[PDB]
């Protein structure tokens, strides 16, 4: 490893310990997989190290026997996924670390672990999982002890637009200085990927509240040129997150759903049923207060 023969060294380690898993204690097997995986981050093959991690099972790894080993397993998984920028996945791993007994019980040691999650969870794209996990972080008491982390979770959880040059400046000296996600040289190249979530977030708020809005006004709110604006719209509709239609003489941008007779007949059915139900319910209370008084 210290010699230039590091390559030949990995190929011997990984081959050996990946066919040897017999009668020996679990604690030792966990250890040899970590060693194998470590070399493979240096190999530049993160895919080799993904396959290895799935050899060791989640059924035999929630015991105090394996406690110090569990933490290192999960720290490595974060490095693998950070290369490939699956941020939602990074966040899941990090969550287990928080829910580990050791970190939770020691007050000081839980402080960095929580903070890292907030960061990555916001860099995720807006999916079904994004919505439920982020509202899990917002509720927690620990989030509320802190105020630096609280401001970031609060921004995305509310259904209010916000402009890029202002989120940037504000949290640049607070959250972007901290290690993991943000901080270092390779990690500063994830600050960038934030700019895209904030403008596409704005578009998510505007579909819901606006139904017609001008192409002219839209350019101003996202703070992007004509050419750029149309691009990130197009990219969102391939993702099937929003419905958008832009007219290229700069007439209308439509967020309003394309309608059919069937959808509409269903909506109106709802309203009628609903009336009949309210008339009866108010009718129970009318009986009580009539005899009573």
């Amino acid at each position: 490893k210290e010699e230039g023969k590091i390559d030949e060294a990995a190929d011997i380690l990984c081959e050996l310990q990946v066919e040897t898993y017999g009668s020996m204690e679990m604690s030792e097997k966990i250890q040899f997989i970590l060693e194998q995986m470590e070399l493979s981050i240096l190999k530049g093959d993160y895919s080799q190290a993904t396959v290895l991690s799935r050899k060791i099972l989640k059924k035999t790894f929630k015991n105090p026997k394996y406690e110090s080993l569990k933490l290192e397993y999960y720290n490595l998984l974060v490095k693998i996924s950070l290369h490939k920028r699956e941020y939602l996945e990074v966040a899941q791993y990090l969550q287990e670390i928080y829910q580990t007994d050791a970190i939770k019980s020691d007050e000081a040691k839980w402080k960095p672990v929580l903070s890292h999650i907030v960061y990555f969870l916001v860099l995720s794209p807006y999916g079904n999982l994004q919505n439920d996990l982020i509202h899990k972080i917002q509720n927690d008491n620990n989030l509320k002890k802190l105020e630096s982390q609280e401001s970031l979770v609060k921004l995305f959880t509310t259904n209010e637009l916000m402009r890029w040059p202002i989120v940037q400046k504000t949290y640049e000296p607070v959250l972007n200085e901290d290690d993991l996600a943000f901080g270092g040289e390779a990690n500063k190249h994830h600050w960038e990927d934030l700019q895209k979530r904030v403008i596409e977030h704005n578009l998510r708020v505007i579909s819901e509240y606006y139904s017609r809005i001008t192409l002219l006004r839209l350019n101003e709110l996202l703070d992007l040129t004509e050419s750029q604006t149309e691009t990130y719209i197009s990219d969102l509709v391939n993702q099937g997150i929003i419905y958008a239609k832009v007219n290229r003489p700069a007439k209308i941008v439509n967020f309003e759903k394309p309608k059919n007779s069937s959808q509409l007949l269903n909506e109106w059915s709802h309203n009628v049923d609903e009336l009949l139900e309210h008339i009866e319910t108010i009718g129970h209370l009318i009986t009580k207060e009539e005899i009573m008084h």
């Binding site: 109106w268 009866e280 009718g283």
Partner: protein
Amino acid sequence: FALPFEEDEKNSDVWFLDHNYIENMNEMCKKINAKEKLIGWYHSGPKLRASDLKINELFKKYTQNNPLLLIVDVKQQGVGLPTDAYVAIEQVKDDGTSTEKTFLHLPCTIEAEEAEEIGVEHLLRDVRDQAAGGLSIRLTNQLKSLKGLQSKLKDVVEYLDKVINKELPINHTILGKLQDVFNLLPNLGTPDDDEIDVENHDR
């Protein structure tokens, strides 16, 4: 099964209930069939009162569910069932109170065994008309539904005349509920009205 019950209404704090009778009877019924538990008590009507809540407390004592209060109206009014179900629900609520016990209505319907259904049918010389099976039956029902709707609307219309002219108090919570009825109304002379027209054509 019946209990003896005497009501004195001079003081609604004066009541008769045979305590011992209840415990004795509970145990005998369990030896025929074990699925019988105390799930409540019926009140014979012929209306709801504000007084049924003094009595309800006596039955919470016995039970592991909230007692069902079945107000069985015994002159029998309605083209529906004259049986109301109420279960006492406990929730914090401010309408001049801090913690409210109130009674929430639940639907009354029937379910029957093989034996019991056939025994009903056997009494009846009727072919039913609460069924909504055939064309004939559903016609009868549609007209009963319109008559059901007009009679309830009067009860709502008279209740509101009694606040404003026979002076009961202004109950924000009640009205509040009423308001939304009007808010969620259909409005025609819009494309919504038009989708209906196209619908009629297809059928």
